[PDB]
Point group: C2
Chain length 151, copies 2
């Protein structure tokens, strides 16, 4: 498997986003999912905060995994965003965040939910990879790498 | 919340374990859970491999989060193990593993499962913390720190 393969489409790889707030990214993250899925952009952003205010999803070193539950979702959804300027994110190490991969899951929990979030974490966590994502300009290549880590 | 608080008791903080195989730790991890829970030590170790051979749960830099599903479990269970000598674990970065926190969850998935694995990941992932765990000798203090990260 590739596991991020079937839920993170190319549409959902967003390169460089000039943006200022934690709210700002969450709003844009809302627009992304709203595009390839029916889902209201507002419900995504509200729900991400309904998790982020509960404690930062920053993983350390510019990396974050904001995620949440969605009311009507039928299968989980993911995105990836880079930022022009790293934003203050209240990360564990105090550093600003510029790389982040978003995960939404349905209310109804799957055994897979754990293993998909864990794959994401492990991916962002490794710094050999963390650098490749921080530098790559080709969008096709940032998708291939994301959805083909451990194949 | 503290979140690792209610599932990772002091019993389940094991300091320094002279051991050689990935199988060896998994066997000992099996004995730990077998102690504070009814569960057969064998079923834990078998099940962890039934996940580890599916891809390494090493998170990078001596850190691993081996985990699995258990047939009769009523609430999730966790442990923490340090190793005398870091063992070859097939981690993403090629480094041997000496720190690892084990997670078992019931077959029946909860929304919480994701957020509890994610808390563990974020904790091990941050290297300011990673060092404190790698050095601390007092077992009481290694429990307090584990179960009180973001309180």
């Amino acid at each position: 498997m590739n596991r991020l393969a079937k839920i993170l489409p190319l549409e959902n790889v967003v390169i460089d986003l000039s943006v200022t707030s934690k709210k700002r990214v969450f709003e844009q993250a809302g627009l992304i999912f709203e595009n390839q899925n029916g889902i209201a952009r507002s419900t995504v952003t509200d729900n991400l905060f309904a998790r982020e205010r509960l404690g930062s999803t920053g993983l350390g070193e510019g990396v974050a995994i904001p995620h949440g539950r969605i009311k009507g979702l039928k299968h989980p959804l993911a995105a990836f965003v880079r930022l022009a300027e790293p934003i203050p994110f209240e990360a564990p190490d105090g550093q600003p965040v510029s790389l982040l991969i978003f995960l939404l899951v349905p209310e109804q929990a799957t055994q897979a939910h754990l293993e998909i979030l864990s794959e994401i974490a492990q991916l962002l966590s490794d710094r050999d990879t963390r650098e490749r994502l921080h530098t790559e300009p080709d969008r096709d290549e940032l998708h291939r790498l994301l959805t083909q880590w451990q194949p």
